[PDB]
Each structure stands twice: as structure tokens, then as C-alpha cells.
Amino acid sequence: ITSGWTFGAGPALQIPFPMQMAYRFNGIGVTQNVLYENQKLIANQFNSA
Amino acid sequence: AYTNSFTRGVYYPDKVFRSSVLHSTQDLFLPFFSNVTWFHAIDNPVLPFNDGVYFASTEKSNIIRGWIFGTTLDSKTQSLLIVNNATNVVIKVCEFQFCNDPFLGVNCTFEYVSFKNLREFVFKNIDGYFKIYSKHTPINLVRDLPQGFSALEPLVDLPIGINITRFQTLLALHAAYYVGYLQPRTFLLKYNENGTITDAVDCALDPLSETKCTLKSFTVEKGIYQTSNFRVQPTESIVRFPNLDITPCSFGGVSVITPGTNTSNQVAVLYQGVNCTEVNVFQTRAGCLIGAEHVNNSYECDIPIGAGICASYQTSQSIIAYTMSLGAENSVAYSNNSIAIPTNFTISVTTEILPVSMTKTSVDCTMYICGDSTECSNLLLQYGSFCTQLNRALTGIAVEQDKNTQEVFAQVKQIYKTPPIKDFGGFNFSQILPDPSKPSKRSPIEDLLFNKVTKFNGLTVLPPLLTDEMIAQYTSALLAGTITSGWTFGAGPALQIPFPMQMAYRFNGIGVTQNVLYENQKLIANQFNSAIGKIQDSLSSTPSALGKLQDVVNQNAQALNTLVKQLSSNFGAISSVLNDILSRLDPPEAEVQIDRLITGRLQSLQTYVTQQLIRAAEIRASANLAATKMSECVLGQSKRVDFCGKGYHLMSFPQSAPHGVVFLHVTYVPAQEKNFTTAPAICHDGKAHFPREGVFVSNGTHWFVTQRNFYEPQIITTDNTFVSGNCDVVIGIVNNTVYDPLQPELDS
């Protein structure tokens, strides 16, 4: 949770959670701004889930 | 506690010429704690007796001259009474008029008629005969006799055993006694071919010797073992039988912890499941310990004992107990405006070992069970073809082995070769490259592996079909194709692409700009060469890699030895030699002896094939995994996390091993990091801006953009940014300006 996947092969590097989530979303093939424009609703959905 | 005829006192039970082989024999021998003083008659005369002397010192005599005695100081029993003419003797329990005090001058047969020359004697009255053994060396000092390891070699004798009195090996040419303290147990011997051999070993000096005899070996290796189960002493029966509740007594194994023999010899003992209150003392949950203490400092596990506690040879080094330690703790600073970035890299080399196959054997059921006896056959045929179906199954697994080998190493269609010029842009691949100068065509690391890595009763071994030579040919061809053509040849025809842009492609595969390689070529080459050198040295130094292969080799050898040994038992039969069997004792109980033979080989050879079959299942899963790794990580590049080495994989080369395979992984690792600050977005002209790739950072007075695996600031333009939406909805935008790249062309 603290360092994403960075620590898996080297020294851990701090990085904000929303930026990590944006990296994940770009990984799946969606532009990053979508996360920013809906982050509150996404967090609500995640808590409900 | 050793003061010698040395570890003689092992007499030779018979003349059977065992040679260079282990065998432990239980016989009549002598107990511990033999001490004695020197007295007056109101410095070693006749000893506490049996036949000779004790266990450690040095001498050489020319001393003894005279005698008037009895060997038991009686002369009614066998005295050292010399009316024995050295060719014929007299020994008299033969009843003559005995004088109660002996004298000296100025029927009881040897021909057959009335000693540091360590000739043992004979008065072992198994039905009344007489004889002598013989060996030789002398006494001029405290005790002695010499050293070796085995019994000697056979020429002429007539053996029945001994009854004289002074425990042996004897004292002569080429007040009260003194002897030492010896433990009686079995005695292991090793009759070398040349016959320069004297000694043996005991089993219960201490748990060290207990392991020594339990493992049936001498070079006890570092580890933990359990000897014969220590039944908790049932001093008396239970008061429960006829003529509030009662619970039976416990029991448990006795465990021994020890370092290597050459390392040291001090040993501790572990008791399993027992309570010390109910039996140095170290009370623990596991049980009782000696030499161990609750020590504040801790380490990782080195010699595991169990129950969440591990012991090691530690403070010099001694057997101590410590609580488990996982590792150091760490934490990081996470904030809404924090970020870390690396700046430097490095190159690493790792290895990997896997088994590939196992040897093939065969067994001839009919002769193994019958000994090639017509009577045995015409009795045995009534049962069935179970042995034949066993042979069928064995043949099936034998062919399956070669099937697996061919499957794993049949992934190439065409062979290649390297050009005579080895100009490879500074890279020195001569290490893993085969050398024609050697008698074989293997690389020096393969040669180092080959040097470092080092029956007639119907048993047969089937040689395989593939040889080391063309296995090496296959490996060399694969390496040459890989280096010459990259990964293109794995999908179609051969295409030539040089190494520099080959590695440029590899770097680009992991999101790294290709100019980095061109701007660091010499550094990367030097790092690679140093890594190759250090892996040569590491593999030349550490010998602990080959354990996986050694395990299966020793497993098969042990199984074969066990099945061979099990034949020699009697299973209740009067004899084990079939010829004497049918000559004397018929098959009312030779039919039960062949029944127990066939059923004992049902378990033992169905389990030959059964643990060899579970072993085949394990080796087949291993071969499947090996082929998968071959194809995925050798013919291409894998995006899987930690599937092949640690880090970001770049290159892979396979190497051949006896019944195994060797891999080298080349990975990329970041080295140096620095702190920075970042923000999500920028609002220059009231409009939101986002990075096309990378991330936005600031040095404090300026703002830049760079990739996510290497630090390289860049000026913010519209080439790497795009517009989407206004600046109100987003959170954390900044009031910075983006430089317009079209204006300095428009003004010009």
C-alpha cells in the first residue's frame, strides 16, 4: 500500500495513492483524467464495495 | 579415559574376508569404568581380566623375561603353565595332584598330545577345542599398542574364540594394575585392499556416537537427527487391573544437535515432548536443553529445531538457543505532495538450477525370485504374470524418461555457427562461448561444472539415447542463434540485427528511452564484464548449489542398496541359500519362504516403482516447468513479475548439466534516488493541462517533466501535453505557465 509495485524489485519509493491509481488506469488503457474527474464517486463506490 | 592396547579389544570373530566394507557386529565385549589403584602385600600386574590391554598411548619393549604364575592366578584354570613345548602344549583342568604353592626348576593336546606378540588365545569352550590367533608389537612405556582402521587379512587359522584373562591386546616382547574406561557397542571396520588397518568405533560414548552408528557412517554432517526413541522409564506397572482417573505415561524421541565433525565435537541433546520437572538446564516449551540460554541478541534460523525456536553454533561458537528474527524494520514518508525518483542503475547476474531426468533400470523377475532353479520354477508358476506386468510398467516409465528429455531439448530446427571474427562491440562473450581448444567443445563454465560435479543378480541399467556431445551441440547452437539474431529466429526465418540496437530494443521494452544506452555504452559494457567475472568466481567458490542433483542421485542409490540388502534375510527360513534349502529342508517351509519372498518383493519392488513413480511425477512436473521457462524466457521477453530472476529481465542463456540445466538471468536494477516535489496538473490559460507521458516535477524554482524510471528534466511544451476541460473540477492544480513552442517560430 505504501509503495505500489516499486518495492518488488528494488528500494521502495514513496508515491501518492491517487497517482498510483492513475498509473493503474493508464495501464488498463483509459486516459488518466477520468479518475480525477470522478475520484469522489469512485471512492464512494470502493467503500460501498 | 584412554590408555592403551588402543582400540584393540576388537578381536576378529572369523576369517571371512570382508574387504573395504562397513559391517557392525554385536558380540561379547567389555563394559565401562575400569579403574584401579596400587597396593601392598602385607606397576601393572595381572589386570581386570579378559585377554590383553586398554585404549590410548605409545611404546616398544624388549623387556619380559620370566614366569611362574597362572593366567587367572589359579593354575587350576588355564595357567600360563609352560610344559608347552611350543609345538605341543598341556593345559590342565586335567586333574593332577595340584600344589597350592608353585615352584621352579633349573590329553591336554596341541600337536595333539599332552603377549605384545599379540597372539590371542583360545579356551572358548563351544564343545571343547583349543587354538591361537596372532599379531605383534611391543611395550616399553606406559601402556601401548598401535593404530589403523580394520581387522587384518586371512591366510591360515582354525578359529573358535577365546577365554583367557586380561582384556586385550596383550603385553610381552616385540602392586596393582591400571586400565581405562571403554564403552561396549558395535564395531565398524574398513578392510582396505592392502591391509593397513586396525581400528573400529563405538555407538554410545555420547549422542555423537549414537548418530555415528545410527547413520551407519563416519563423517557426520552438520544438522539434526533423532536416534532410537527414548521410552519414558516405566519403573513399575500401573495400578488399574482387577483381582478419579488414571492416565498412561508419556514417551518421546531423543534428538541430538551437533555441528560438523571437522568443525568441532561438542554436542548437545534435545528431548521431545517431555517435561523437565518430571525427569546446565534450560527449561523451554519444547523441553529440556543443555548449553542454551535465553539470549537477548537474535539471528535468523541456521539450524532449525522446531516450535518457532532455532539454535546455532554461537557464542567461541557453541550450541545456544535464540528466538526467531525476521528482519529490520523500515518506514517511509507519504504525503499529498511527495515523490521519489531514481537516478542511476546497475547490472546483475543470477543463476538457477533444475533437474531434468533420472537413470533407467531393469529387473529380471524369474531369476531374481528363483535363483534359476527348475524346481523353483515348477513350483512358482501357479501364481501368475505379476512380475511380467511389473516389467511392462517399468519399461513404460523408462521410455517416458527419454520422451521427457526429447521434449525439453527438441525445440530447435536448424543449427548455426559464429563468424571467425568475435568483434561484439566491446562485449567479451568468450566466457560462455565454447572453446575448440578443449578436448570437448564446452565453455569453461560448463567444464567447471563437469569437474566439480562428480548389481549382477539380474540387475541391469539401460543407457540413454542422447549423449553429452550433441546435447552440448544443441546448447551451443541455441546460444549462437540467440546472439546472432535476437528473438526474431524464434518465430520464422533468420534475420540479422546487431547487438547495440538489440539492447536498445530491450531497454525500450521496459519503458526506457533508447539514447541512455548510447550515452552509457562503456559503463554498461564494463558493468557486464565485471558481473560475468564475479559470477565465474562465485560459481567457482560456493559448492552448495549441486544439492538438488545430489539428492536424487543418493536417493536412487539408497533405494537400490536397500532392495539388494533385503534379499539376504531369512524371513524365518532355516537357511537363505536355495541349494542347501532343497537339499535338506523341503518346501513346506520353503513354500512359505518363497511366499514371503514374493510378497516382500511385492511391497519392495512395487515401491521401487512406486517411489520411483512419484519421483517420475515430480520430475515430469519439473520437466514441464523447465520447458515452459525455456520457451518463455529464452525465445522472448517475459512481462511476468519475478518469473525469471529478480528485477527487469533482459537476457537469458541456458547451460547444460548432468541430468539438469543451468540458467543465467541478466536484470536491471535502479541504484541512486533523490527527493522531489510534484503536482497533478497545471492551469496556464485558465485551461487544464495533462502530461502525455511521464510526470510533472519541480526543483523549487522551475517545473519539468521526465519519465518514471530515469531522471531527465525537460521544458514543458504542447508536444508532451494536451488539454481537457477547465480548471475548476480538478483538485490541486497550479497557477503555472506552459511555454508555447509555436510563438518562437511565429515571431521569427
Side-chain angles (χ1 to χ4, degrees):
Chain A
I1 180 62
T2 42
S3 88
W5 77 88
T6 62
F7 78 102
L13 324 165
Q14 63 274 38
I15 176 167
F17 196 67
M19 316 204 34
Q20 155 177 336
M21 218 56 23
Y23 270 41
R24 300 297 175 131
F25 259 31
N26 192 5
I28 199 146
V30 183
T31 171
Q32 43 206 243
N33 61 292
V34 181
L35 169 52
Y36 302 120
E37 295 151 317
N38 318 280
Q39 104 285 17
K40 196 169 185 177
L41 187 67
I42 296 152
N44 303 356
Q45 297 163 6
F46 177 82
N47 306 351
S48 316
Chain B
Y2 260 52
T3 179
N4 55 343
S5 86
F6 175 40
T7 70
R8 322 298 178 67
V10 281
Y11 45 110
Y12 310 161
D14 200 292
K15 333 207 227 166
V16 160
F17 186 35
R18 305 192 275 109
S19 44
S20 316
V21 288
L22 283 183
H23 163 43
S24 81
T25 302
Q26 160 195 357
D27 274 345
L28 67 170
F29 284 98
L30 270 302
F32 208 38
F33 257 35
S34 44
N35 196 316
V36 50
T37 73
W38 160 29
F39 255 114
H40 173 63
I42 208 61
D43 65 357
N44 40 3
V46 283
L47 299 105
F49 275 135
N50 313 277
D51 320 281
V53 191
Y54 191 51
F55 266 40
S57 46
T58 175
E59 289 178 307
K60 153 263 176 191
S61 75
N62 201 331
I63 61 109
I64 285 188
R65 318 296 328 158
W67 91 271
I68 173 59
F69 329 101
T71 50
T72 82
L73 169 143
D74 310 330
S75 198
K76 150 264 301 177
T77 63
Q78 78 308 357
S79 153
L80 202 67
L81 67 80
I82 303 183
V83 54
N84 312 302
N85 216 348
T87 78
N88 74 277
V89 307
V90 177
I91 199 50
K92 276 206 169 197
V93 191
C94 328
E95 185 38 83
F96 95 111
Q97 158 57 24
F98 36 77
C99 67
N100 296 41
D101 260 355
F103 79 111
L104 68 92
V106 189
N107 157 50
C108 316
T109 77
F110 193 29
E111 277 156 22
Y112 262 50
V113 72
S114 178
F115 289 122
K116 273 276 210 150
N117 249 16
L118 72 93
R119 61 196 175 140
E120 310 147 44
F121 252 116
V122 156
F123 169 15
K124 174 37 61 183
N125 224 47
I126 313 323
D127 211 23
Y129 334 110
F130 326 98
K131 185 247 184 173
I132 53 100
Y133 299 108
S134 39
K135 305 96 194 152
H136 305 326
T137 170
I139 37 181
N140 80 71
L141 269 171
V142 76
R143 329 299 314 182
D144 92 338
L145 278 144
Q147 186 172 23
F149 189 89
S150 202
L152 298 322
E153 269 168 8
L155 163 146
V156 306
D157 221 23
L158 296 164
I160 47 175
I162 326 172
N163 293 336
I164 57 153
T165 46
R166 39 191 319 153
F167 165 100
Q168 39 190 3
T169 38
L170 249 177
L171 64 144
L173 321 174
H174 307 286
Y177 38 98
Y178 178 73
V179 289
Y181 295 3
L182 74 166
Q183 202 88 73
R185 257 95 199 170
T186 81
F187 300 111
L188 295 211
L189 312 172
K190 281 292 285 163
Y191 309 69
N192 81 312
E193 176 65 47
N194 278 0
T196 67
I197 45 191
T198 84
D199 284 352
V201 72
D202 174 292
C203 315
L205 300 315
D206 64 351
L208 208 160
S209 296
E210 308 200 74
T211 87
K212 268 196 150 189
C213 273
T214 304
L215 280 201
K216 243 289 197 183
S217 37
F218 262 84
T219 317
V220 165
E221 88 279 3
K222 168 184 191 170
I224 166 174
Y225 327 91
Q226 152 191 8
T227 60
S228 171
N229 169 80
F230 158 57
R231 152 63 60 198
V232 171
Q233 305 309 134
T235 85
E236 289 154 272
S237 66
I238 200 52
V239 195
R240 197 35 163 167
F241 274 124
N243 38 297
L244 278 186
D245 187 21
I246 308 298
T247 282
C249 200
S250 182
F251 55 106
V254 49
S255 302
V256 49
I257 309 131
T258 181
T261 56
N262 67 335
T263 75
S264 169
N265 38 8
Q266 195 190 120
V267 170
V269 51
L270 163 61
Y271 272 55
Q272 309 161 206
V274 317
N275 194 296
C276 315
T277 62
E278 293 159 26
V279 179
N280 169 242
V281 179
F282 185 48
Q283 158 58 38
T284 80
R285 171 140 281 266
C288 316
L289 286 313
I290 302 162
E293 314 86 332
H294 282 326
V295 182
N296 292 334
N297 87 85
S298 49
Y299 302 101
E300 70 290 349
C301 191
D302 323 315
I303 306 137
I305 83 184
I309 295 100
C310 282
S312 73
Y313 210 48
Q314 200 33 291
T315 44
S316 73
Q317 303 304 263
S318 77
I319 326 161
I320 74 158
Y322 46 87
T323 317
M324 271 315 327
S325 95
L326 308 187
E329 209 155 69
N330 197 340
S331 53
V332 285
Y334 147 70
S335 95
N336 58 338
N337 36 37
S338 173
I339 168 64
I341 285 285
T343 62
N344 211 354
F345 62 92
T346 186
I347 298 307
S348 306
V349 170
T350 68
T351 83
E352 196 30 86
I353 292 312
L354 281 178
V356 171
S357 69
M358 93 185 59
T359 168
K360 311 132 67 177
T361 51
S362 176
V363 160
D364 193 14
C365 76
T366 168
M367 52 75 57
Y368 178 88
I369 305 153
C370 265
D372 297 296
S373 158
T374 297
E375 145 65 10
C376 178
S377 47
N378 57 58
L379 73 82
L380 194 154
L381 72 173
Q382 325 277 0
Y383 283 79
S385 151
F386 326 108
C387 90
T388 84
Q389 75 207 54
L390 296 200
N391 311 134
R392 154 213 69 192
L394 165 66
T395 313
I397 79 164
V399 80
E400 187 269 351
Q401 290 314 117
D402 305 316
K403 170 259 183 171
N404 278 351
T405 292
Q406 180 71 16
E407 157 205 284
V408 48
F409 273 10
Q411 282 218 354
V412 157
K413 56 162 181 22
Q414 290 197 2
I415 85 162
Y416 310 99
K417 50 197 165 292
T418 60
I421 313 151
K422 302 301 182 278
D423 189 344
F424 288 111
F427 297 77
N428 198 313
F429 284 111
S430 53
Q431 191 271 318
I432 44 175
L433 216 48
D435 187 12
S437 183
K438 294 284 193 177
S440 171
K441 288 199 169 180
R442 302 180 302 234
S443 83
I445 181 51
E446 296 179 323
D447 193 43
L448 279 187
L449 284 166
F450 272 86
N451 322 110
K452 179 74 137 163
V453 185
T454 59
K455 195 170 184 179
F456 306 110
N457 201 357
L459 274 309
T460 42
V461 285
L462 308 161
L465 82 171
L466 298 179
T467 81
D468 45 25
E469 181 159 24
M470 38 42 60
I471 291 294
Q473 296 294 341
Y474 268 120
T475 56
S476 164
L478 202 31
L479 256 300
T482 305
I483 175 180
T484 44
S485 83
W487 82 96
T488 74
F489 94 109
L495 327 169
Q496 62 283 7
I497 306 103
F499 34 85
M501 68 305 292
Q502 175 176 349
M503 322 316 148
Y505 288 165
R506 301 300 198 131
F507 282 0
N508 187 31
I510 59 164
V512 179
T513 85
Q514 94 182 236
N515 45 315
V516 182
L517 163 60
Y518 296 120
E519 299 180 57
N520 305 267
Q521 198 163 328
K522 321 305 304 313
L523 177 142
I524 297 154
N526 303 352
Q527 279 198 23
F528 174 82
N529 285 346
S530 149
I532 285 288
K534 95 209 181 303
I535 192 47
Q536 312 147 6
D537 318 315
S538 168
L539 202 42
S540 322
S541 58
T542 175
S544 55
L546 292 317
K548 289 174 186 171
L549 316 185
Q550 212 58 47
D551 187 306
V552 71
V553 175
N554 295 130
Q555 191 44 261
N556 87 93
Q558 174 272 344
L560 251 181
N561 279 34
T562 306
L563 61 95
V564 169
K565 155 262 175 182
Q566 280 285 13
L567 178 46
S568 167
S569 157
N570 270 328
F571 323 122
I574 64 105
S575 163
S576 55
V577 47
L578 262 281
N579 282 78
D580 311 55
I581 283 158
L582 56 175
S583 46
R584 296 300 87 72
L585 166 143
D586 296 23
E589 218 152 331
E591 81 90 28
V592 316
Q593 95 91 13
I594 184 46
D595 163 6
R596 300 153 196 193
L597 180 46
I598 201 48
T599 181
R601 318 292 74 55
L602 163 43
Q603 314 81 10
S604 52
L605 329 170
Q606 162 291 314
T607 43
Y608 201 12
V609 314
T610 284
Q611 310 73 80
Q612 274 191 315
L613 186 133
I614 309 297
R615 220 89 40 74
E618 307 328 281
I619 206 55
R620 184 194 42 62
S622 172
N624 289 38
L625 192 54
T628 302
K629 282 218 180 181
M630 192 30 48
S631 317
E632 278 214 30
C633 275
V634 182
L635 274 311
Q637 178 173 25
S638 172
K639 299 286 302 187
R640 304 170 70 177
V641 172
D642 210 333
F643 186 61
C644 293
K646 300 200 85 77
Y648 303 147
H649 164 251
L650 306 188
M651 273 321 79
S652 310
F653 324 112
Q655 293 291 264
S656 60
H659 315 331
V661 77
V662 188
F663 293 119
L664 315 178
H665 293 148
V666 186
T667 82
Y668 156 93
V669 170
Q672 303 163 5
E673 53 279 49
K674 300 169 54 61
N675 286 331
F676 295 95
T677 321
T678 190
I682 308 164
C683 192
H684 164 46
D685 295 335
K687 303 317 287 169
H689 286 74
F690 291 79
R692 276 191 175 83
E693 76 285 340
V695 83
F696 291 158
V697 301
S698 199
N699 78 324
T701 43
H702 327 88
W703 289 85
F704 306 108
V705 62
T706 195
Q707 61 244 32
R708 328 160 198 287
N709 315 308
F710 199 77
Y711 179 78
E712 258 306 326
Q714 286 291 73
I715 316 108
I716 302 155
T717 85
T718 64
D719 284 344
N720 38 38
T721 58
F722 63 93
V723 190
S724 177
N726 55 302
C727 303
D728 309 61
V729 195
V730 86
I731 299 164
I733 216 172
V734 316
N735 288 357
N736 201 271
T737 84
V738 49
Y739 144 82
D740 198 318
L742 184 60
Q743 196 55 27
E745 326 304 318
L746 293 167
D747 49 21
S748 172

